[PDB]
Design a protein around this ligand. Structure first.
Ligand SMILES: NC(=O)c1ccc[n+]([C@@H]2O[C@H](COP(=O)([O-])OP(=O)(O)OC[C@H]3O[C@@H](n4cnc5c(N)ncnc54)[C@H](O)[C@@H]3O)[C@@H](O)[C@H]2O)c1
Ligand SMILES: [Sm+3]
Ligand SMILES: [Sm+3]
Ligand SMILES: [Sm+3]
Ligand SMILES: [Sm+3]
Lengths: 493, 493, 493, 493
């Protein structure tokens, strides 16, 4: 991994509309902070409804029948998505460092994980551009019926701050591959990298208006997109709380298509026959990954009684060794929580757990006096009714529950409003299969966790979402089907 | 066509839950009227939230992992759907007669069109039960990734009164084929036929709880389903106005999946090289079909100037010959409008058109003093800004507009909030191709209209809906994808 | 199971062409024998090239563009396939008894297994008729490219005698569902049942010429189809030896499409962790099923040393209790071998095994002096180089080999020219996964054997075939793709 | 178009096996000639059975389970294909020049057409690598059935000389995208470019043994692959004559999978309402393109009598202006015929036509005394029974036939053993629709010709082939389906 620049230059910090950078109509700006220090990195333009409106107009124009983007070859769309990937790889070290600076996650991770996954995502959807065929349908009568899978139109895409570059990639990949136009609202906590990529979009040769990126706040620029009378589809990734708002906004207005990838409280079921060493390390990763700031985190580790104590002993030991520190330090495994708000938020949960009567196995407190660092906390002997066993903590706080039978664990694991993911650690074939099928989750990892693939769909089962976001499934939400039934002289098979 | 019984006996008039008939919790009932006479056919149980809740519980139970329906083989689901089809065909004369008595549409149509389309739909989806495969995905790393296309859960389906039996079949086919459970709310204006088929479902051998039919009112039983914390998905077909409500209800509550098949103001573009005889008859059919009570009706007939006068003269002549009368009379082409409220509503539009300054070419008034009959009205020389040229009349009121160029007609045709369908009559290949691609509609009929096929998707492009309802596409909304990524010792191609 | 008629009346015994029964052009006939007695059931007309040519002519005519069959709705094709299934079910008792009478297999099997699987197959493909869509392709340039999945043409289908009715159904289902015409050659050992179904085809309402069934001999009628200048595609199921002949014939002549489903030597790998009770019973079933006359039979039972002795002991015990007798007796598990030729052939193999130096664990000799009955033989301590461990015996002769490691078993199991199927019995997830992927077989059963599903494909990996025969895959070989690229004034997404 | 090097350096002229260049086992070589001069470009190694065997071994090893290639991620396969495309583009000018030097086609065409199509094809299939999913099948009973789309194995691919680089790309694209290994036999008349790309494969980072290129002769190296006991599948593109041989070879040997892309005699139907200017130029292109050396050339131009005379007059004038000359001259439209053998072969046909009694409208003779140049010949008033109207000329010799009705032209156009392509020029929608469905051709071009797209399949209907070569269809032939049915404790929907 290339040596990063612990202070990457911030080259772009405005609103990107029509391959041009401009300030907010109000000239307002908001600060972005480096979570590791608490110092302001720079000031980004504060987009609002006016800027959203301007962007939507730009996007609508770019989507007009006969525009370069509409007329462009599907193959060339894939070409552009690949060119974008190339530029991103060219600037891999810069983007990784900027990501870590803006987000807090370990540089090594931003580089080897995030950027790799961004590249693999864009490159994956570049190949889908000219392969998402429609169908010729054998209708009754003397007709020739077929379907056109055309773009849904102007797509509003709102993303969170946990995986800035990646969440952007997840949205842009299928949207652009299907020939859609975009008006994206990036998280105010981490806007720096998306803006840089926005410029790479221009450099890649994307037609003006195709991708519009607007930095700003939620109920401001985000809501402006959600209830816009000219945004055809909205893709939202964030809190379940805001998810409700997004959906309600669509109903009250444009009646635009909605897809939501939201919160979770994923159960991590460990059976007695599970390989301990593996089950332990993966259980650690499943929850602490990305400062515990992951939607599909295994927030409820259900360990079978026969191995509970042992597992617990090992989980605590691993949490005890987990190195928290400067994101840029090669040996730092845990960086700071994205921001103070999230910092105090997490601590509030640690407080709740202790108060509701939980076995605090690892120190639940700040790890430093400067950045927003929190100690890898592990709570033992959890009860389903406890807040920390119900609510998404989104911080390095592990919950370890004990179960006896599978009949029992299935019911318990499924007893949640969330249903984004789950995992099963077992050596037995039948137990793996039975559980996979019984768990009401968008993704069930067997003998592993957090395994993401551009080719495999991701999504929620209940209040954790609707619609899938990767693979061929990711193209569906970005397609408007058109049936054309033509009368023919005489139909034949 | 078998001679019907002008007065079919109403055998079922209660709430169907768990293969059993019960009265409403409140014991309240509401009358159902025969639009041809204005007399009450009988009184149906008035379902409300309480009944909806009891139906949802029955549905949830039927969906329980390990229940007969869950464990049932996909093939047997197809068997049950076919069995249902057979029983419906067995009772074809009865159901067509009852349909006509409760709805108003001509008996010949109920029999040859509706009932035929009902059978073709169910029989089509019976074949999909065991064929909607999931996928094995070539993911990166040593894993085995695949997807499970599982049922979405408890499906709430709300249908209108224009095609009672058909709208029900449109909903039940894909829902049942995919292994889902149903809580259906039937239109208060025409509940009788749905209830009969409800019992046929029991007789077919469908497990109790799988399909629950609730007769009642909209803001009552309908809203109860839309905002239910235990209904996983809602499928709505009705007005765009109510559609907003359905979507907002979902966001404020369960965040359930939503699909909307709503209103329209479909344009019927007639080019000068169109075969007159055909273009005229089909343009007549396009708007007057089913008492003009059709979502995708060609409510805006744009005739190219070069043939405008001639076309209009023939349109009016055709309207003048259109026989309005007793739906049971074999020569009756037009029955009465579903109910007085719709009656008064249609006349209100004829009034608007006149006042807005339109060429009333065919008498716009009642056609009788008994039932709810209205004269096949034809308005000529319409202007896009006129209400009747903007709003969905849903009655036998034809609007004929004139255009010069295609560039112009494309823009005008597309100038609408709706986008459910459209059609183009031409002998020219390039004009057919160009327009079909240019019209923002879920269905574009070329040289025909109202051609529906169980195998071809149907849906709206803007405020006319979201999601498709037929063909393979009709299965999507009823599927919940599950990605199972299993770690393997060593992956190989 | 309905009490059969020990002596079913043979109603049809000629050549079926154009919904009509006629004798062979030569008026020749050949006898069909009841293997349980050795007595002639009746005499069937002997078709040859002359009759095949007449049939092909009939088929070609029925395939003419504009014929009722070509113009027929895809849904109607499905309707006809369903009608055929219904009639077959109506005559289930008769067909089962006739099957047993002419084949030898136990009546209970013919009824509960064969006939059920025939119904399930036809019913499955009925649903495929109107669902095998083509595609609209997003080609570069101003074009509208799409594909038509049309019938391949005149299909010659040659079947074996092991599962008469079933093999017929496997061929007819996909052929007719895709709109093709048929020229079928039925096994001279068991032509009776196929002929009866042939007439049910007529009764179902199938257009004349669409399905032509020709009873006769191999190098006679079979070869006549194989090298016919007007047969578009040949589907063969038989011996690997004849398979070579069929493909060579195609290349020599019409260059028609070829698919072969041939012989096997399927390995059954039982690992130490396997549940004995089940592994032993399924291992018994995997080999002895249908008088050991099954292409995918587990002809090489590789038992892991740690449980070899124990396993063998039980295999033998089960072999010893295996009831061989009158197919019509409820207690009969094993009927006679199809015919004398196969009887002597099987005995030859038992002879071989003994001479090759094998542990004869169960008597390898005739079980009666009347019909063609053979004692369920079990050979222990087999060596890969032994003929009985190499060649397809096709009789109740069990081979039990011993293995130590997976690495070793994989290589050994794969060391065969055949590759039709394999099975793995384990409780371990990783072993199941690893083996499934490592075994070069068209079907790998895990913890079960001979599990067939109309929805899952079946086929060979090497000298055991080419192409798949069930599920959606079974439609491929019966489809001819046509790309239509039309010039459009202006292409848009 | 960059100025080429009229004498590009030949850097590679040996056999490529294991990313290494070696001479033939016999040390024999054969000359490769420049058709424009008749002078020898250089000497290439003459591969034979021995070298094929060597290559097969290399490929077999590269395909071993656990190999870098077998273990490689499908995405990485796509990455390698894209890497190869980049290297090919990097050397576009060199490759174009070398292609022209060894083939004879105009440099401008090699550059803007051939190389462009080469890049487009490879880049297209790069995207397929991780997208050709298998499926999870809803089988009956307590099982989990799914399919694995695995590589077929060692693929032998034999290509002709008309589009050297492109034919290679058509084979390599799907083969490599699906994870297969290759043993390719390149045309003795034009081996130079394939060999250079062979080295670029090495440079791209492809594992050794994955692609082996062998220059040599047909009945020698070609047949050695066709009848190899270890080549799992053979893909052939060449003459129908040799096609028979290839298929026969497969049947006599390994029983390997076969796909043939062979000769044609495509009809070009021009209706009276066809735009003359366009129909005339397209008709010219359709036959003369690539020195008339194109499999799907419109060698039977059926002009509707009403426009016959006029069309012919225009066709002749066009042929009369067609510039034949030095392939490297910007003004050259027609280069020399690949080789003397083909040169005399074409002249033989011109002699035939004259003798058969045809209207020689344009000089049917050599165009120069140096290279292999032939004058753009046009024969008028052709009769279906004439040799030149039946046999593939494969040179610049146009056949113009006259027809009266559609019914007539359909039957005539279809009266051929070939069925590779066809075209229809009409302004009428119904005529276009009717004919497209009526013509038995793998591709029917409407108002255009020779329009190829990596996304749309190409193939023959009769003696012109079997199987398709582009789009998703191109992956089918390179996939081996494996059904894995696992027993599960309890199956649920
Ligand atoms: N893959 C499968 O689906 C499948 C299924 C069942 C059986 N089989 C295989 O079939 C064989 C058992 O059946 P069989 O003894 O009847 O096979 P067989 O080769 O002797 O003959 C089978 C069919 O082909 C015909 N035929 C025979 N010789 C012919 C020739 N020279 N040219 C053209 N047609 C000819 C026969 O008359 C009969 O109709 C075994 O190899 C078994 O494994 C395969
Ligand atoms: Sm927030
Ligand atoms: Sm209402
Ligand atoms: Sm034989
Ligand atoms: Sm040759």
């Amino acid at each position: 991994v290339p040596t990063p620049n612990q202070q990457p230059e911030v080259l772009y910090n405005q609103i990107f509309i029509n391959n041009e950078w401009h300030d907010a109509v109000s000239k307002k700006t908001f600060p972005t902070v480096n979570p590791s220090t608490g110092d302001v990195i720079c000031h980004v333009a504060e987009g609002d409804k006016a800027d959203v409106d301007r962007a939507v107009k730009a996007a609508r124009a770019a989507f007009q029948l006969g525009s370069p983007w509409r007329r462009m070859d599907a193959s060339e769309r894939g070409r552009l998505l690949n060119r974008l990937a190339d530029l991103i790889e060219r600037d891999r070290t810069y983007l990784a460092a900027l990501e870590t600076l803006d987000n807090g996650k370990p540089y090594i991770i931003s580089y080897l994980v995030d950027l790799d996954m961004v590249l693999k995502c864009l490159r994956y959807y570049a190949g889908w551009a000219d392969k998402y065929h429609g169908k010729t349908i054998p209708i009754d009568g003397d007709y020739f019926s077929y379907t056109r899978h055309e773009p849904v139109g102007v797509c509003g895409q709102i993303i969170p701050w946990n995986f800035p570059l990646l969440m952007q990639a997840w949205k842009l990949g299928p949207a652009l591959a299907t020939g859609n136009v975009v008006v994206m609202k990036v998280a105010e906590q981490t806007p720096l990298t998306a803006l840089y990529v926005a410029n790479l979009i221009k450099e890649a040769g994307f037609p003006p208006g195709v991708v519009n990126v607007i930095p700003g706040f939620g109920p401001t620029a985000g809501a402006a997109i959600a209830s816009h009378e000219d945004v055809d589809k909205v893709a939202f990734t964030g809190s379940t709380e805001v998810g409700h708002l997004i959906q309600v906004a669509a109903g009250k207005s444009n009646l635009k298509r909605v897809t939501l990838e939201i919160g979770g409280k994923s159960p991590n079921i460990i059976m007695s026959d599970a390989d301990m060493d593996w089950a332990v390390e993966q259980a650690h990763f499943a929850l602490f990954f990305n400062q515990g700031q992951c939607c599909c985190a295994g927030s409820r580790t259900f360990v079978q009684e026969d191995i509970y104590a042992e597992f617990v002993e090992r989980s605590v030991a691993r949490a005890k060794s987990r190195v928290v520190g400067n994101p840029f330090d090669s040996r730092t495994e845990q960086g700071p929580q994205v921001d103070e708000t999230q910092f105090k938020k997490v601590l509030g949960y640690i407080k709740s757990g202790k108060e509701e009567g939980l076995k605090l196995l690892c120190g639940g407190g700040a790890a430093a006096d400067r950045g927003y660092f929190i100690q890898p906390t592990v709570f033992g002997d959890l009860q389903d009714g406890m807040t920390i066993a119900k609510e998404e903590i989104f911080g390095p706080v592990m919950q370890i529950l004990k179960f006896k039978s599978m009949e029992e664990v299935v019911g318990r694991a499924n007893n949640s409003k969330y249903g984004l993911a789950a995992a099963v650690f077992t050596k037995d074939l039948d137990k793996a299969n039975y559980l996979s099928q019984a768990l009401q989750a968008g993704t069930v990892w067997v003998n592993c966790y957090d395994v993401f693939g551009a080719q495999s769909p991701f999504g929620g089962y209940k209040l954790s979402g609707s619609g899938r976001e990767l693979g061929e499934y990711g193209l569906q939400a970005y397609t408007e089907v058109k049936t054309v039934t033509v009368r023919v002289p005489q139909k034949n098979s």
